[PDB]
């Protein structure tokens, strides 16, 4: 059976987490995203000026082209990328997927051209949302799952410290107590779960659904929830230069918790201080609006407080406080 551990590292302020991946012999630093199902990388098919500052995949060296297949994806923050497809060997934490579809970028939007922290994304959402045309392909996880000791992956994302991606096994030393599981609705291709209620400092409210997403930096909630939270933070104000609600870095922030199948997942107020707003003397809040989309995005701010198991059997999500 196979299993493996890949180490992740946050970039400045934990904006994103990158992990090395070897594709056809070349190691690239990718952002693992449980919110999408495409494995795409910077390649030699991009204009030379865009390859700058990145490790790039050269498809002609080792990939097998899928004649006539294309891919095109657009993300929640407005970024997008597109290209062609090859199959190659992909190794993550010593687990190798042979014949994994690799989406070589031909076009990337400005957000990606400006980000030199990563060399592409490795999607970990369900394969049902992979964008390859005319026939969708399976994610790295779906490609290898039958070979793992257990068909699951688990993650521990940390605040300014290296974390891990466990593939095919659960490391019990990464959390306190026992895991609590909840069912996942994968109808929209995400690792979606329900919360029965929430507590924002001194205020509690009714439940809602959300997706566990390693690819989103913050905890994005309904505006009602955001208002309620910030109404308890002295001097909090929206700052479009910063991207949302900001406050004095010294502010004591209330905690935020959700009740999941009887388990209370708590994000301490210290983890809600994201960092310097990068606009004056304030800090940006880890909780911001979801723009009215109807569901919440449990991004890195939330994840930094738990060890999370993504189990294909159910499917289901397991949670426990990080040790």
């Amino acid at each position: 059976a196979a299993s493996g551990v890949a180490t992740n590292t946050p970039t400045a302020n934990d904006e994103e987490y990158i992990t090395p991946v070897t594709i056809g012999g070349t190691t690239l630093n990718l952002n693992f995203d449980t919110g999408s199902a495409d494995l795409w990388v910077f390649s030699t098919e991009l204009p030379a000026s865009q390859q700058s500052g990145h490790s790039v995949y050269n498809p002609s060296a080792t990939g097998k082209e899928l004649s006539g297949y294309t891919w095109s994806i657009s993300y929640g923050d407005g970024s997008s990328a597109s290209g062609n497809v090859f199959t190659d060997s992909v190794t993550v934490g010593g687990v190798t997927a042979h014949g994994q579809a690799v989406q070589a970028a031909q076009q990337i939007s400005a957000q990606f051209q400006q980000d030199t922290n990563n060399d592409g994304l490795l999607g970990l959402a369900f394969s049902s949302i992979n964008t390859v045309q005319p026939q969708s392909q399976t994610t790295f996880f779906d490609t290898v799952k039958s070979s793992l000791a257990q068909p699951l992956f688990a993650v521990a994302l940390k605040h300014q410290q290296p974390g891990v991606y466990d593939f095919g096994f659960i490391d019990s030393s990464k959390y306190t107590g026992s895991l609590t599981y909840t069912g996942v609705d994968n109808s929209q291709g995400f690792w979606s779960f329900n919360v029965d209620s929430y507590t924002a400092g001194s205020q509690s409210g009714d439940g809602f659904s959300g997706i566990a997403d390693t690819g989103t930096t913050l905890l994005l909630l309904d505006d009602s929830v955001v208002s309620q939270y910030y109404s308890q933070v002295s001097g909090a104000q929206q700052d479009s230069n910063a991207g949302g609600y900001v406050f004095d870095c010294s502010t004591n922030l209330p905690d935020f918790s959700v009740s999941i199948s009887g388990y209370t997942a708590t994000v301490p107020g210290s983890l809600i201080n994201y960092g310097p707003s990068g606009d004056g003397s304030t800090c940006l809040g880890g909780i911001q609006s979801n723009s009215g989309i109807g569901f919440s995005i449990f991004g890195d701010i939330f994840l930094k407080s738990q060890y999370v198991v993504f189990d294909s059997d159910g499917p289901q999500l397991g949670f426990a406080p990080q040790a």
């Binding site: 929640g76 690819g215 995005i297």
Partner: peptide
């Protein structure tokens, strides 16, 4: 930050 980003929103994948």
């Amino acid at each position: 930050x980003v929103v994948x």
